[PDB]
């Protein structure tokens, strides 16, 4: 029917479905959404423009849109224990931009986690609007432990006097002490924003402490560990802040929201409020720990910080291949996607890096367990140690295909 009209597009979508089936996805930001989240996004709510907020719309015909957006807001509030939520940001970048716009002025100093240790692009990369508009100053982990050192972060905050401190990371494997971050913010009179995008599903699942009681404002993506549609979310307990956030999102940065994506956010948040989501989060944690253990045991690989207590970890591969870029290329030859990744105090260039980052959420959402996870990391050790032996990669490829065959994506 509708696909006969555009075979080039619809065939490419079948190819991507098959590609996702035959791939072992370890990119730590990826997940596998439910059928219901996809269907929500494919509905006729896309036809209706909803500029404004529930009960305060520009346009009539919005009573039902209002029920759907209210459901998203109420479920975010319930799941994360916050008194206000805004479900309109189109992305995590828009969510973060709305928060800077609400709490600080162009030119103010912001402290964020060093891009080599886990900081996101929107936490002050010079190539980001973040870096261009505000004065970002980065904090790092300790050189020797590779852990956050809250005394060192406090001593830097006293020198730099930020207006806003950002906590959260895309490559930190350990539990963040949000209460200490709020104590640091308090000691220098800064706001604390936490970007929980990478860990939000473990926060919902109960496996990572919540930032919501400690941060002035919490942002997140609805995708990644929370396993929702791609989009943003902002949370706060402060009603004056909530009103600034609302105006910064619309009409400050966006026009009307994507109400079909907001319906998919409502669906994903009810999935996360279900008891099975806690089990999901336990398996994320155990799968990641099983893979990190293979690299820990092995003499030629070091895990940054020695391990993980979340969904991901970094590995210094440089004793085995030249750089993380090479490691990423080799593993792509066996149907395993991950990303090269700077390690703390990274010596090589950003385009090479000394490391890979590995995450467990996608394989976990396909039903894989600890045994599979250990096996995948054993395959990665093999392929990297044998990168210039085409015979070997070929056999690992065939092994990988038996595994993917056994854990159907959908």
Ligand X SMILES: C[C@H](O)[C@@H](N)C(=O)O
Cis bond before residue 251 (omega within 30° of 0)? yes
Q: Which of residues 213-252 bind ligand X (CB under 6 A)?
A: 221
Name the residue among 199, 190, 124, 196 with its Cα closest to residue 163: 190
Indicate whether 189 belongs to the interface with a copy of itself (CB under 8 A): no
Q: Where are the alpha helices (DSSP H) in 5-91?
A: 7-21, 35-41, 63-80
Beta strands in 267-347 (DSSP E): 302-303, 312-316, 336-337, 339-341
Residue closer to ligand X by CB (options 22, 49) is 49
> What is the per-residue binding string for ligand X in 34-63, x denoting contact by CB under 6 A?
---------------x--------------
**Beta-bridge partner residues of 221:** 232
Partner in contact with 262, chosen from ligand X, a copy of itself, none, beta carbon below 5 to 8 Å by kind: none
250 is in an annotated binding site: no
239 marked ligand binding residue: yes
350 is in an annotated binding site: yes
Per-residue buried b or exposed e for 227-258, using 16+ beta carbons within 10 Å of the residue's own CB: bbbbbbbbbbbeeebbebbbebbbeebbebbb
We find the least distance from the C-beta atom of residue 284 to ligand X, in angstroms, to be: 18
Closest distance between a copy of itself and the C-beta of residue 173, in Å? 20
Which span sits near a copy of itself by CB under 8 A: 126-134, 179-187, 370-378, 387-395? 126-134
Query: Contact 199/220 with Cβ under 8 angstroms?
Result: no
- Pick from 209, 252, 306, 307 the residue near a copy of itself by CB under 8 A: 252
- Tell me which stretch binds ligand X (CB under 6 A): 3-11, 85-93, 294-302, 351-359: 85-93
Query: What is the DSSP annotation of 244-259?
Result: HHHHIIIIII-SS--H
By CB under 8 A, tell whether 350 contacts a copy of itself: no
According to the binding rule CB under 8 A, does residue 230 interact with a copy of itself? yes
* Nearest CB to a copy of itself, comparing residues 93 and 354: 93
- Residue 325 as a binder of a copy of itself (CB under 8 A): the answer is no
The whole-angstrom separation of Cα 347 and Cα 85 is 41
Residues annotated in the binding site, as ranges? 115, 119-121, 239, 349-351
């Amino acid at each position: 029917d509708y696909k006969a009209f555009d075979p080039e597009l619809w065939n490419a979508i079948d190819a991507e479905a098959e590609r996702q089936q035959n791939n072992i996805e370890l990119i730590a930001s990826e997940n596998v959404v439910s059928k219901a989240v996809m269907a929500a996004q494919g509905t006729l709510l896309t036809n209706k423009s909803a500029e404004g907020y529930p009960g305060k719309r520009y346009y009539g015909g919005t009573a039902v849109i209002d029920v759907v957006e209210t459901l998203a807001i109420e479920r975010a509030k319930k799941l994360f224990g916050a008194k206000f939520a805004n479900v309109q940001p189109h992305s995590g970048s828009q969510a973060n931009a709305a928060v800077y716009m609400s709490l600080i002025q162009p030119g103010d100093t912001v402290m964020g986690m060093d891009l080599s240790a886990g900081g996101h692009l929107t936490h002050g990369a010079p190539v980001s609007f973040s870096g261009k508009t505000y004065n970002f100053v980065s904090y790092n982990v300790d050189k020797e432990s590779e852990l956050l050192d809250y005394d060192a972060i406090l001593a830097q905050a006293k020198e730099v006097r930020p207006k806003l401190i950002v906590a959260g990371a895309s490559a930190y494997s350990r539990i963040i002490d949000f209460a200490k971050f709020r104590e640091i913010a308090d000691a220098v009179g800064a706001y604390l924003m936490v970007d929980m995008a990478h860990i939000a599903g473990l926060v919902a699942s109960g496996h990572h402490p919540s930032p919501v009681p400690y941060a002035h404002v919490t942002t997140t993506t609805t995708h990644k560990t929370l396993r929702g549609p791609r989009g943003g979310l902002i949370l706060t307990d402060d009603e004056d802040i909530a009103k600034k956030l609302n105006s910064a999102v619309f009409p400050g940065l966006q026009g009307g929201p994507l109400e079909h994506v907001i319906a998919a956010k409502a669906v994903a948040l009810k999935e996360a409020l279900d008891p099975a989501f806690k089990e999901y989060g336990e398996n994320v944690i155990k799968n990641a720990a099983a893979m990190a253990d293979v690299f820990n045991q092995h003499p030629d690989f070091r895990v940054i910080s020695g391990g993980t207590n979340n969904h991901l970890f970094l590995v210094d591969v440089t004793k085995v291949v030249e750089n993380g870029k090479v490691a990423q290329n080799v593993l792509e030859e066996v149907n395993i996607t991950l990303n090269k990744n700077s390690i703390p105090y990274e010596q090589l260039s950003p385009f090479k890096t000394s490391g890979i980052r590995v995450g467990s959420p996608a394989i976990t959402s396909r039903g894989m367990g600890e045994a599979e996870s250990r096996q995948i990391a054993e395959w990665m050790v093999e392929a990297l140690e044998n990168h210039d032996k085409p015979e070997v990669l070929e056999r690992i490829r065939g092994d990988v295909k038996v595994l993917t065959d056994a854990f159907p994506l959908y």
